[PDB]
Amino acid sequence: DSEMCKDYRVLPRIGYLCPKDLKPVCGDDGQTYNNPCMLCHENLIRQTNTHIRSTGKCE
């Protein structure tokens, strides 16, 4: 969850760092992010501090 973004960093050459395990998470904003770390990634561009609503893709 954003709790991981509480202390993360992203540069032009480093970019974002996420695991290779694909884990579908649900977004509390009514959205879904394939990989969990990819959630903070889409949050880095939106900058809305989205958190995981539930494990797995939203249903």
From Swiss-Prot:
Cysteines paired by S-S bonds: C5-C40, C18-C37, C26-C58
Top-rank lineage group of the source organism: Eukaryota
Domain spans labelled Kazal-like: 1-59
Cell location: Secreted
Expression sites by tissue: Highly expressed in the thymus and stratum corneum. Also found in the oral mucosa, parathyroid gland, Bartholin's glands, tonsils, and vaginal epithelium. Very low levels are detected in lung, kidney, and prostate.
Post-translational modification, as annotated: Proteolytically processed by furin in individual domains (D1, D5, D6, D8 through D11, and D9 through D15) exhibiting various inhibitory potentials for multiple proteases.
Disease linkage: Netherton syndrome: An autosomal recessive congenital ichthyosis associated with hair shaft abnormalities and anomalies of the immune system. Typical features are ichthyosis linearis circumflexa, ichthyosiform erythroderma, trichorrhexis invaginata (bamboo hair), atopic dermatitis, and hayfever. High postnatal mortality is due to failure to thrive, infections and hypernatremic dehydration.
Entry comment, domain topic: Contains at least one active inhibitory domain for trypsin (domain 6).
Functional summary from the UniProt entry: Serine protease inhibitor, probably important for the anti-inflammatory and/or antimicrobial protection of mucous epithelia. Contribute to the integrity and protective barrier function of the skin by regulating the activity of defense-activating and desquamation-involved proteases. Inhibits KLK5, it's major target, in a pH-dependent manner. Inhibits KLK7, KLK14 CASP14, and trypsin.
Name of the protein: Serine protease inhibitor Kazal-type 5
Shown segment, full-protein numbering: 989 to 1047 of 1064
